[PDB]
Design a protein around this ligand. Structure first.
Ligand SMILES: [Zn+2]
Length: 233
């Protein structure tokens, strides 16, 4: 097989454009901005998990102060209902009121302990809300930089796509087809002959085949014996 040397040089640039598009696709899946957004999202979920755990403890303490204040109201109402006054049975109410006054005091002790504990946890929850709010703000900053990097990679991809479309139209389709058949093997399809090493698979070509490669004409097309990529000189 043979092909004009002018289009063989176009095939070399064509293999260069394909390599650049490969790095663009690789960069789109390995962005540094995406890694930054992954970190901020992780620790934002950390505070969201701690905020949810604090909400459970606050619900439990809210249920305690609701049960405490309700039982004191029953003792307070019983003290006020019995406050409205038989003198023989009056002493019977005096001994009960003293025992109920001891119950209202003992209940107020437990109520102040859980009110302090609720006041401490509401401050901790307030400290985590400030923390997750600051994390969320720069999370959107990382999200705008992640999206801004994707539109730059896509813009550079479209420009290399237009350059690739122009090169294929300038080469005989019989040569472009062989380049695609070699890429279907996983190789680079076309690479330069750098000294004695292939520019694609990076092998060291033996002295035997290389003696025949240097003897081929300019219009001739040659491939690497190990990978098959079209060697260009
Ligand atoms: Zn090769």
């Amino acid at each position: 097989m043979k092909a004009e040397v002018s289009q063989q040089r176009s095939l070399l640039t064509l293999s260069e454009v394909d390599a650049e598009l490969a790095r663009i696709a690789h960069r789109g899946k390995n962005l540094a901005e995406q890694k930054r957004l992954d970190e901020l999202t992780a620790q934002r979920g950390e505070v969201n998990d701690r905020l949810a755990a604090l909400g459970i403890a606050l619900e439990d303490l809210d249920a305690q102060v609701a049960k405490y204040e309700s039982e004191i109201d029953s003792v307070r109402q019983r003290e006020d209902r019995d406050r409205a006054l038989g003198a023989k049975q009056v002493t019977e109410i005096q001994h009960e009121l003293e025992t109920l006054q001891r119950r209202q005091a003992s209940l107020e002790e437990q109520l102040l302990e859980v009110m302090e504990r609720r006041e401490e946890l509401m401050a901790e929850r307030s400290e985590e809300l400030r923390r997750v709010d600051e994390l969320q703000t720069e999370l959107t900053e990382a999200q705008q930089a992640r999206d801004a990097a994707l539109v730059e990679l896509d813009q550079a991809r479209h420009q290399c796509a237009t350059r690739r479309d122009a090169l294929v139209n300038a080469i005989d389709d019989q040569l472009v087809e062989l380049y695609e058949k070699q890429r279907a093997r996983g190789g680079a399809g076309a690479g330069p002959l750098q000294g004695r090493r292939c520019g694609a698979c990076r092998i060291e070509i033996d002295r035997g085949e290389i003696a025949r490669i240097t003897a081929a004409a300019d219009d001739d097309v040659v491939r690497c014996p190990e990978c098959g990529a079209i060697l260009l000189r």
